Amino acid sequence: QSNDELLEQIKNLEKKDKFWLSPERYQLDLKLKKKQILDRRQMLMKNR
Amino acid sequence: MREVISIHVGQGGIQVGNACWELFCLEHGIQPDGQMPDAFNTFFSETGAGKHVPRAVFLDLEPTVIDEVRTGTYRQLFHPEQLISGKEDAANNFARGHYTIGKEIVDLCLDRIRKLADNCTGLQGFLVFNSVGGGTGSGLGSLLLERLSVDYGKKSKLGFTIYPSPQVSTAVVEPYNSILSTHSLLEHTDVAVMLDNEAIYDICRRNLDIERPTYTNLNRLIAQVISSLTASLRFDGALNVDITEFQTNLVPYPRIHFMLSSYAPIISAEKAYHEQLSVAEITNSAFEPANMMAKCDPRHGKYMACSMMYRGDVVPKDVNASIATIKTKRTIQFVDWCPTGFKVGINYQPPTVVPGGDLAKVMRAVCMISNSTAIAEVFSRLDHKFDLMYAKRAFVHWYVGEGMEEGEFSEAREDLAALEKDYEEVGIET
Amino acid sequence: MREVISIHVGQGGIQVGNACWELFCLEHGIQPDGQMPDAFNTFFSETGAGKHVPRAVFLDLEPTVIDEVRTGTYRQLFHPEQLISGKEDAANNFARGHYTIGKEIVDLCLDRIRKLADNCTGLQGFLVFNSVGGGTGSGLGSLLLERLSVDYGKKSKLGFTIYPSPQVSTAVVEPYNSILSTHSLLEHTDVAVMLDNEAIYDICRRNLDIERPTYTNLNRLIAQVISSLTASLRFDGALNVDITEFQTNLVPYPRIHFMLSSYAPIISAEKAYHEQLSVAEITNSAFEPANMMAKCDPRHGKYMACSMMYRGDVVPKDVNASIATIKTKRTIQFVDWCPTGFKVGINYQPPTVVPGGDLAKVMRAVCMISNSTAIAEVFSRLDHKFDLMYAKRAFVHWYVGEGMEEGEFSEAREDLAALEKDYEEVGIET
Amino acid sequence: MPQKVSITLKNIEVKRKEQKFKSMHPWAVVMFDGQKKTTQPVQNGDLQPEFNQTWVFQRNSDVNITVSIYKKEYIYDALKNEKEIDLLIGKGKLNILSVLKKAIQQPQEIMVDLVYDFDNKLAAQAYLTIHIQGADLEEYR
Amino acid sequence: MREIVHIQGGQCGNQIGAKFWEVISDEHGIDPTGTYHGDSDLQLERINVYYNEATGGRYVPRAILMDLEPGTMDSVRAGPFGQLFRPDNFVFGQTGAGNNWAKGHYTEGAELIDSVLDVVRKEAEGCDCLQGFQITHSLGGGTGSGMGTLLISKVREEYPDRIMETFSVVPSPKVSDTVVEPYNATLSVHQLVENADECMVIDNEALYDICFRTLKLTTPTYGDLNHLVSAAMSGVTCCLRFPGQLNSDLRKLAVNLIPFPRLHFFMIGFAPLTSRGSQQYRALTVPELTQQMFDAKNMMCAADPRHGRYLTASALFRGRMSTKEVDEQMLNVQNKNSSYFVEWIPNNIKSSICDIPPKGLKMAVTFVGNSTAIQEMFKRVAEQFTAMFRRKAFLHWYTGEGMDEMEFTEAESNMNDLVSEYQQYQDATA
Amino acid sequence: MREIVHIQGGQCGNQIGAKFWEVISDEHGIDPTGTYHGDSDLQLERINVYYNEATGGRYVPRAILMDLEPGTMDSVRAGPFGQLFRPDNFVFGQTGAGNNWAKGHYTEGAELIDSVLDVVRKEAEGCDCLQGFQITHSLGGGTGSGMGTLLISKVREEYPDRIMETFSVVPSPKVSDTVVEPYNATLSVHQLVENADECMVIDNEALYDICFRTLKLTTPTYGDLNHLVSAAMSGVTCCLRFPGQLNSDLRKLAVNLIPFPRLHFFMIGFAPLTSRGSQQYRALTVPELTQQMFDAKNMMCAADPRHGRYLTASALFRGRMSTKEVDEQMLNVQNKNSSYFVEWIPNNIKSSICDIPPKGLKMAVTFVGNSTAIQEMFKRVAEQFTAMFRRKAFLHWYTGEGMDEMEFTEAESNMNDLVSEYQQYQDATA
Numbered sequence A: 001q002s003n004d005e006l007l008e009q010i011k012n013l014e015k016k017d018k019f020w021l022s023p024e025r026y027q028l029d030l031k032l033k034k035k036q037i038l039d040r041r042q043m044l045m046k047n048r
Numbered sequence B, C: 001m002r003e004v005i006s007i008h009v010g011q012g013g014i015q016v017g018n019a020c021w022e023l024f025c026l027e028h029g030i031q032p033d034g035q036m037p038d039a040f041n042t043f044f045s046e047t048g049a050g051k052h053v054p055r056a057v058f059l060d061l062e063p064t065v066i067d068e069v070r071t072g073t074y075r076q077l078f079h080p081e082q083l084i085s086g087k088e089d090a091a092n093n094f095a096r097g098h099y100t101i102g103k104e105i106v107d108l109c110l111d112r113i114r115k116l117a118d119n120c121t122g123l124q125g126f127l128v129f130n131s132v133g134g135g136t137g138s139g140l141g142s143l144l145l146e147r148l149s150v151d152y153g154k155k156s157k158l159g160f161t162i163y164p165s166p167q168v169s170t171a172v173v174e175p176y177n178s179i180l181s182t183h184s185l186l187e188h189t190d191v192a193v194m195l196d197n198e199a200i201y202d203i204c205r206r207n208l209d210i211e212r213p214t215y216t217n218l219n220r221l222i223a224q225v226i227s228s229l230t231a232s233l234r235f236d237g238a239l240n241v242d243i244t245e246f247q248t249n250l251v252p253y254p255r256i257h258f259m260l261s262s263y264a265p266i267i268s269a270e271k272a273y274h275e276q277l278s279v280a281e282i283t284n285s286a287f288e289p290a291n292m293m294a295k296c297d298p299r300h301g302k303y304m305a306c307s308m309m310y311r312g313d314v315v316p317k318d319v320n321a322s323i324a325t326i327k328t329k330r331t332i333q334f335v336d337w338c339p340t341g342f343k344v345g346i347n348y349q350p351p352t353v354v355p356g357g358d359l360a361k362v363m364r365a366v367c368m369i370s371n372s373t374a375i376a377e378v379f380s381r382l383d384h385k386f387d388l389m390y391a392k393r394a395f396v397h398w399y400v401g402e403g404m405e406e407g408e409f410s411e412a413r414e415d416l417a418a419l420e421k422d423y424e425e426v427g428i429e430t
Numbered sequence D: 001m002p003q004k005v006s007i008t009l010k011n012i013e014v015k016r017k018e019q020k021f022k023s024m025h026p027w028a029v030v031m032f033d034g035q036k037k038t039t040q041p042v043q044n045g046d047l048q049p050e051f052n053q054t055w056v057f058q059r060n061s062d063v064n065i066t067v068s069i070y071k072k073e074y075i076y077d078a079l080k081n082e083k084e085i086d087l088l089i090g091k092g093k094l095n096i097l098s099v100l101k102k103a104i105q106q107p108q109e110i111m112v113d114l115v116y117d118f119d120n121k122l123a124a125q126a127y128l129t130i131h132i133q134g135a136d137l138e139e140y141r
Numbered sequence E, F: 001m002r003e004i005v006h007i008q009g010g011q012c013g014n015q016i017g018a019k020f021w022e023v024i025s026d027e028h029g030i031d032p033t034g035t036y037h038g039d040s041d042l043q044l045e046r047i048n049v050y051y052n053e054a055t056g057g058r059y060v061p062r063a064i065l066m067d068l069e070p071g072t073m074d075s076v077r078a079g080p081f082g083q084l085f086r087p088d089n090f091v092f093g094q095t096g097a098g099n100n101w102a103k104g105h106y107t108e109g110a111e112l113i114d115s116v117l118d119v120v121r122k123e124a125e126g127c128d129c130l131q132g133f134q135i136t137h138s139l140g141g142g143t144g145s146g147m148g149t150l151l152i153s154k155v156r157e158e159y160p161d162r163i164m165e166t167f168s169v170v171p172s173p174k175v176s177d178t179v180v181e182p183y184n185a186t187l188s189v190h191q192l193v194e195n196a197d198e199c200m201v202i203d204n205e206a207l208y209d210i211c212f213r214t215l216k217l218t219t220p221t222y223g224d225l226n227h228l229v230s231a232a233m234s235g236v237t238c239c240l241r242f243p244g245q246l247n248s249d250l251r252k253l254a255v256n257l258i259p260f261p262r263l264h265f266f267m268i269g270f271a272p273l274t275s276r277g278s279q280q281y282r283a284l285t286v287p288e289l290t291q292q293m294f295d296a297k298n299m300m301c302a303a304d305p306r307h308g309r310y311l312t313a314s315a316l317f318r319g320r321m322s323t324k325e326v327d328e329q330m331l332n333v334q335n336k337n338s339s340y341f342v343e344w345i346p347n348n349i350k351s352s353i354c355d356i357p358p359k360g361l362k363m364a365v366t367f368v369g370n371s372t373a374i375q376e377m378f379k380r381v382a383e384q385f386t387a388m389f390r391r392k393a394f395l396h397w398y399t400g401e402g403m404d405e406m407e408f409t410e411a412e413s414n415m416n417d418l419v420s421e422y423q424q425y426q427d428a429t430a
């Protein structure tokens, strides 16, 4: 899954849920944060 | 309010009954005179003031052993008129003790059984002891079992028969009456335990280090096994087992109820205390093929169900930790259609020691009653021995002339063939 | 929670086992009766109340030595039924103790080994002692090692074999069974230590100043070496070493695991206290070629790795200052592909003295286990001795008639040739 | 492999004349090697109910076929509710070893005497057809 | 008001009750003679929940004890606090079931149950406002698993609106003490789902694991397992006998923990549990309680709760503590473990606070969670059942007392349907 | 706030911690029973950095002790201040690694590490604001250098933003105690560079040199080396536990001493150090401290710092002193030694002042300098590694547990690349 696909899923859940924090949104935000950390680590490894 | 009645018939039966009745009297504190100087009620009865009377009856056609009993130190214990005695011995002839002289004695025994049963209120079942390779023993045991099966019906009966050894034998005609008695008790007894003498001789030689044993040493071990089996009825325990809770756990099918026993530890006081006798090592020793109480190899067959009793200070978690180890081993394999096969009982009373005996005093012991597919070998070898002499009709005239029909030998052979086929049919995996 | 089991087979093995078992009992304060009037757990086991039982088993086919053991002062210590004894001796015939009479005894020994192993929870490994130049010793050692290598697998086994002297010999046929046993333990033992008698005789003569030594004096020195090797498992130390930490430090390649030992100081009380016994002088004496415990010259070959144990009040800086001096010397040269070759262990417990013995009490001692390329000379001379008689097939009929095949002698010769070629191939610089 | 035994219950002949059963609803139980098979009740069954039912049993170890015949009987309880009960008419036991040699080659017709458990008297006779559907003992060794 | 009566059956249930009532009496300060000797006023305000009042000021439990054999109740009477039980409530037979479900549910259990139902009806009709019944029994025994479950149906038929509790011990395949356990376990689970309003499974294997790993005591016994089960039992109804911030009776838990009427099989756990040597190290705080409460090894069942997702959860805190901390910790334990909580029901954790802690402890927690991981127990029970049933092993014992194989087939099918439809919601998504 | 947890592994790390915690407890006035008996108010304000609080008012270190053998932790418990450690944090195996890196990192260390990671996660999740972790272990041993480095990667994978410290003892070729030191040193350095945020090398040879030359004590022991290492360890975090003119946590040092992420291998030193007989002669002044601080023999490593140029330097002064003098002396030590400081980064010395001196001393300094002279240690380690590896000596021990020679080749290549790119900046000019 691309970072853009995960952000689009989060935005589509924000449009569907009247509540700012559904359990599904919280799991997707955790997935996005984990992936951004991996991409940042890969960039730091490529820059070495 | 729980009772059991033990039947002793034949010379071997009486000689093992004596062995168990010193042990019970010693274990319950009763002096040989019968006087104490609420657990006794399983084997004994209170007379109102003073002495206790055993719930046992002694049978024999040959009077020597009973006369020896009635003059020893235990003359005051047994009721004078429950030691039924005959005049003429059957002389190793099965047809004699089933058709000729046993019929005139069996009525008195049945009257005594009724008189003992009317006293009990919670009768658990009957015990019977008989050496199979003899005339009066096998014949009267067969006749008594056949009468009891119809007089009482669903009451449970347990048989501690002593089959002949594979090669060691005292008589020359014992296969005939052994086969006939197996025929008789196959459809009439709920449990049968194997007790041939050769295995117990090897046990004594290897562990007890006795090079010249006599019958008393064998009978004491058998008495200890009986006491371990029946301890749960008369002592408090964390995991109790009753006699009626056997055919639901050890008997997969009505035909298959022959199983072989083992006991552990067996050790003398000269070297017993040098080792710790942990529960794991005793439960390992109990499963050793060389410690079987019958000369059969369990490595030659599958297991069906194992019922094994502990007594002493054993803790259940240590028992589970040892059952797991046995399930781990690759040399012991159970039948496919039995995922769990162990029934465990735990009792608190340690085994009692008889003074002047062989066994020492220990705090832990284990007695196992295991039903296995390997038992068919004794049937096969007894059948082979029978066929050799039945081919030429040897010794048959001693049986035809005592009222038995010619065809009675063949149907016992057919029933043994059926049993051997059934044991093979059960042991195959699905 | 750390244990080790020692195996003693043959007359020499039993006679050195006695020597080590006085020393261990003395070092842990246990009386000869086995009663004390948490370090014992490595060699002993607690029985619950009172006595301790050694984790050792004695094997022999000839009953004299075991009977001597079972009547001496140590009759109460060992468990009565772990002193396995035979009836007929192998009589210096290797084929007898590997094919004829050892097979019927090996099963009992393996059962005893299992019964001892199930008690241990942290089993480090096995120790075995056997004089190589005998029938039962070499044959049963080979068979036991071969059975253990498959029953347990990766558990470590250590062998303290006593090879024959270069020229001094007691038998006339010992090269044959020495070569065969070397064949057997080459692919089956993790460590083998050289122990020929002539070098230790010279040590006693030069240092202990005894002109008429007996076997007991030799066995006491061997026992001291064993105690020094295993001290680190049962005493607190600044730099500990375990048994499993050997094949990673002394064994460059799986085939090469024969090494020779030395000990220092060896001195009598009459002149011990006149000199200070500094660590530098003892570590110099330990590396002297004349103080090797096997009659081999280290000046004839390179060193591969040196593992050397200290015990007492030694300080690590003094040890380093002495390792530097040895690296400085021009007469001791290491192999090219090994820049550092020393493994050092330091323990606090000083060596214990046996009353009435030869060695005096000292505060510092050093024991070295060194693997060197010079060991090939003993193999070459044993091979030369073997070839002389195998050219004419002398004494072969005593082996062919005991079930061994004709070709079995040749492949041991080929394996020795392979080992000698391997030792030459390793010692060349890159 | 487990041997397959085909057992057909053809008919039963009830011999006990002192029970003129007004309306019999007879049904049968065939048991072999712990496996139980049951017929449907015959409506208006005379002293000779026909079943013509065939079952295949797997043989594991038993040699005995047990046949039992029952009737339905309606009894009023103490509250006058009609309670259906199964009354045993008779039970018989056949050892398959007696017919095994012939029953392998072709279906065998066999009569089984059914006795009443209370008096052991002949109550009925069951007519069975038995057909038995080893070569691999060396292959297994 | 809103009180409950106690009914127990079988040996295991009697042994559980023998400690449950001791724990309750110690909590309320009742001496073994029935005389109050407590310290606090609150100890007497709600004593009508479990205890009745008689003349002379003594208190008597409203417990009913039933078994098919008299031994266990004749033994529990001689134990501590055994005199509290009213002799009239003891009902027993003279035969027993022998671990046979058919005998304890069709032939023997049917005739005896009228007498025990008479006293049950006497107890329930009299009490002020009924809350319900709680049942303790074992699924591994015949008489218990038969008579208890039939009594469940009989009680449910007469009191359809009251609540019903059952604490059921199911036979684990690890520690097996009876060979016929799968049959009477599978037969009992069939009837138990149809009538019990709540069911709580307890396993001996999990109790041994807890005792060995968390408490780290050397020799577990049945007294420790009974004590843990008793503490867990008492923790559920604590707030019904004492004041608190948020009182929550059994019916409130029934509303909040059972989503669908057939999903009412919970697994429980008690915190804190610490070893004797580490009871001084630990500090009792709400985070420390909640981290141990959700620990997988702390569950009273061998089922692994991280192999599935919780449908709902409940916690019953004891002692005086702030509610804000409890709520925030419950939220935190649900945010950090979102993967193990089903997503289509938000806020699926219930909390309650009781201001009266257990005697000797300042804080305590009882956990009751409905999880999908319980499927594994029924899976293995059905696996053993279908492995044993395909050969019709031990089937004749059951079929000889009016039962047939059709009831076995229906029970297996219903149990498999329960297994399937319990996991149906595990894969359900919103 | 901003506290750290302690994790140690191996025997060497355990012995280092056994003195580090004693030094910390003596600094904070904590008795070996966990009871505070200090004099100053500041001794308790920031005690949450290293100590936790439990009921009863006693304090417990947040240390985690791990090893593959139980001996060292069973010995450290009996030493002084050994009771402070929580028994729950002790995790150990039953086998050990035997100085084999593969066993302690692939086969045995992989299965055990889950339990220690559980308690590590428990400790880190709970604490107020995490600062980071500090690790003590030795590169000369198998279990330490394997399990510690794998634990480093596991911790880094879960806490990528926290800081990580490692105090690593590398095997010097002068004082060698293990023959297989180069293999597990080279394998460990490969993994250590990828995950550790800071690394501090310590050599036994340099400690012996310091003890013999500066303190001039006759008999150094491991207790003195441990005491020096402990003082150096405590000096780094002093200002994080006490007020000062310029507080500087570990992260601030990380920012200012690491120019590029792969250059984080420092060598340290402690001042003042004086002999017992000369402690009265000397006067403690800032010039006297700074002249000894930059002394080449005072470094805790055998690396000669005037064989290269400092990339940066740091100093942590203790005691109350004027800042103007500190700054001018730092400038003077940098103007007089311009040849040994790299020229393209001006003002490459960091200073900090803490107003609380060590107990018993009025002034103290801890020095942490990143220099290019450290290349010599990796050069000699790689030289020994390539001398031993070219013949594949001792390789089979590692290759028998799933490891291959490719991981050796990659480790050697990466280590050589590190050596090259570390000196690349030494010749760099502006």
Ligand SMILES: Nc1nc2c(ncn2[C@@H]2O[C@H](COP(=O)(O)OP(=O)(O)OP(=O)(O)O)[C@@H](O)[C@H]2O)c(=O)[nH]1
Pocket: B009, B010, B011, B012, B013, B015, B016, B062, B089, B090, B091, B092, B093, B131, B132, B133, B134, B135, B136, B137, B138, B162, B164, B169, B170, B171, B174, B197, B215, B216, B218, B219
């Ligand atoms: N274990 C054991 N077996 C015995 C003993 N006495 C006899 N037997 C066995 O019994 C077999 C023969 O039967 P017996 O009991 O001696 O004689 P019996 O049963 O009274 O039959 P009769 O010969 O007609 O008197 C022999 O083969 C023995 O093996 C005994 O004391 N102990």
Ligand SMILES: Nc1nc2c(ncn2[C@@H]2O[C@H](COP(=O)(O)OP(=O)(O)OP(=O)(O)O)[C@@H](O)[C@H]2O)c(=O)[nH]1
Pocket: C009, C010, C011, C012, C013, C015, C016, C062, C089, C090, C091, C092, C093, C131, C132, C133, C134, C135, C136, C137, C138, C162, C164, C169, C170, C171, C174, C197, C215, C216, C218, C219
């Ligand atoms: N060091 C030492 N060597 C011994 C001792 N006793 C015998 N040996 C050696 O053992 C060799 C022969 O083997 P033995 O141990 O005596 O006899 P064995 O191993 O039992 O073999 P068998 O002759 O079959 O009984 C001789 O060459 C001796 O050198 C001893 O007490 N100490």
Ligand SMILES: Nc1nc2c(ncn2[C@@H]2O[C@H](COP(=O)(O)OP(=O)(O)O)[C@@H](O)[C@H]2O)c(=O)[nH]1
Pocket: B238, B239, B240, E009, E010, E011, E012, E015, E016, E099, E138, E140, E141, E142, E143, E144, E145, E176, E177, E178, E204, E222, E223, E225, E226
């Ligand atoms: N917790 C506990 N379990 C027990 C105790 N005694 C027996 N059990 C369990 O109960 C099972 C046997 O049940 P059983 O006694 O046959 O029940 P019954 O048929 O109703 O008498 C065994 O598997 C034991 O694990 C006890 O004192 N405490």
Ligand SMILES: Nc1nc2c(ncn2[C@@H]2O[C@H](COP(=O)(O)OP(=O)(O)O)[C@@H](O)[C@H]2O)c(=O)[nH]1
Pocket: C238, C239, C240, F009, F010, F011, F012, F015, F016, F099, F138, F140, F141, F142, F143, F144, F145, F176, F177, F178, F204, F222, F223, F225, F226
């Ligand atoms: N400073 C110090 N170093 C030690 C101590 N004990 C051992 N060492 C060093 O540690 C090295 C051996 O490490 P080792 O014990 O095998 O580590 P392990 O494999 O993790 O147990 C030796 O080279 C010693 O120099 C000690 O008490 N203090």
Ligand SMILES: [Mg+2]
Pocket: B010, B011, B062, B089
């Ligand atoms: Mg006789």
Ligand SMILES: [Mg+2]
Pocket: C010, C011, C062, C089, C136
């Ligand atoms: Mg000899």
